């Protein structure tokens, strides 16, 4: 009784765990695509950034 | 991460049930030599006693 | 991390040796009680012809 209960538990649990260590590895993977998201718009700001400062040193020299 | 922790706990509770086994077999099978070495032993006294 | 990968093989040859093991075991106990066996089928037959 108590070895076949072992058994049982250690499979259904295996399973569980899989599912789980899947569950993070997806939020994983979502959060890899936010961050190569950042990181082009991240780009995206420092060039509107740079943009800015020409702007402002124009300006600066227009007076 | 926590799911690491416990999977890798059950496994570690597996592998004592396997040496538990293990050492259940052991175990069976000294009493099995024990008895099979007495036997012996009966054997050869009944057939020398016999002889006698 | 490449104390885990390596150290796995080692895990993954320590479950095999215990699963090896229990087999041999498992193994020796079935032949140690064949032989009791015979070994206690002829003590009953000697027992019998010293009677005689």
Redo the contacts between chains.
Sequence with gaps: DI?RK?MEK?LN??QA?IE??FE?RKKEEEELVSLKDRIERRRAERAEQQRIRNEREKERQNR | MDAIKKKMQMLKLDKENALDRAEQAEADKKAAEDRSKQLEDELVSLQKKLKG
């Design positions: 070895h072992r250690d649990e295996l765990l789980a260590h993070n």
